RNA sequence: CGUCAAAGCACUUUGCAAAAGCUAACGUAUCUGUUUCUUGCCUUUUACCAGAAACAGCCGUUUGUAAGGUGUGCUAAUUUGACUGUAUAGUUUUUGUAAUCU
């Protein structure tokens, strides 16, 4: 769209918001939502998260289900913990990498 | 304008209660009477004359409250009150200079 001017009112701001998804990088969230693809999360405390993604916010606030979360740290020993459902604040997201289900 | 709360609401009839507290129009209006004094005209009384003080009456006004009436509603309408009431990932607070060890 020809409105990245960043000086907008509410309706065109919402249009730009939806375009920020429909073609922006956050577009990866939609096809991950609709294709039910595996997505891995890198948190800012060196945490590894992999799970289904169901909904996301523009802030990258994400609701996850069936999360497998692993962390490593004596001698370096990797450990894992599976939790049913997650609400992760997009503040702490560093990286997302998708594992295609197919 | 917004949110929350409780009250049906608008208009109206009647009863009860109150109306200066920090000197100030309950009424931006305005009458009558009684008692006690001082006066005026006076043959005596009422009826009077015009000033004061202390008291009352009448014509009115405002507010609170209680029970009703009319017209509209409760499948919503209006009124009253309270409120620390609004955006915003791009340096001054809320979308992380973090983890790492000590
Ligand atoms: Mg005689």
UniProtKB/Swiss-Prot annotation:
SUPFAM superfamilies xrefs: Sm-like ribonucleoproteins
SMART domains the record matches: Sm (SM00651)
Keyword Phosphoprotein: no
Gene Ontology molecular functions: RNA binding
Keywords in alphabetical order: Cytoplasm, mRNA processing, mRNA splicing, Nucleus, Ribonucleoprotein
Pfam families named in the record: LSM
Domain Sm: 26-102
Location within or outside the cell: Nucleus; Cytoplasm, Cytosol
GO annotation (BP), single: spliceosomal snRNP assembly
One cellular component term from this protein's GO annotations in UniProt: U2-type prespliceosome
Cystine bridges: none
Function description: Plays a role in pre-mRNA splicing as a core component of the spliceosomal U1, U2, U4 and U5 small nuclear ribonucleoproteins (snRNPs), the building blocks of the spliceosome.
Stated family: Belongs to the snRNP core protein family.
Subunit structure: Belongs to the 40S cdc5-associated complex (or cwf complex), a spliceosome sub-complex reminiscent of a late-stage spliceosome composed of the U2, U5 and U6 snRNAs and at least brr2, cdc5, cwf2/prp3, cwf3/syf1, cwf4/syf3, cwf5/ecm2, spp42/cwf6, cwf7/spf27, cwf8, cwf9, cwf10, cwf11, cwf12, prp45/cwf13, cwf14, cwf15, cwf16, cwf17, cwf18, cwf19, cwf20, cwf21, cwf22, cwf23, cwf24, cwf25, cwf26, cyp7/cwf27, cwf28, cwf29/ist3, lea1, msl1, prp5/cwf1, prp10, prp12/sap130, prp17, prp22, sap61, sap62, sap114, sap145, slu7, smb1, smd1, smd3, smf1, smg1 and syf2.
UniProt-recorded name of the protein: Small nuclear ribonucleoprotein Sm D2
Organism: Schizosaccharomyces pombe (strain 972 / ATCC 24843)
Gene symbol of the encoding locus: smd2
């Amino acid at each position: 769209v020809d409105k990245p001017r960043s000086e907008l009112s509410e309706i065109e701001l919402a249009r730009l918001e939806e375009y920020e998804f429909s073609a922006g990088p956050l577009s990866v969230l939609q096809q991950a939502v609709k294709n039910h693809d595996q997505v891995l999360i890198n948190c800012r405390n060196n945490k590894k998260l992999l799970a289904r993604v169901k909904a996301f916010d523009r802030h990258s606030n994400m609701v996850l289900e069936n999360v497998k979360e692993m962390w490593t740290e004596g001698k370096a020993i990797n450990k894992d913990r599976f939790i049913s459902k997650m609400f992760l604040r997009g503040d702490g997201v560093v990286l997302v990498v998708r594992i295609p289900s197919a």
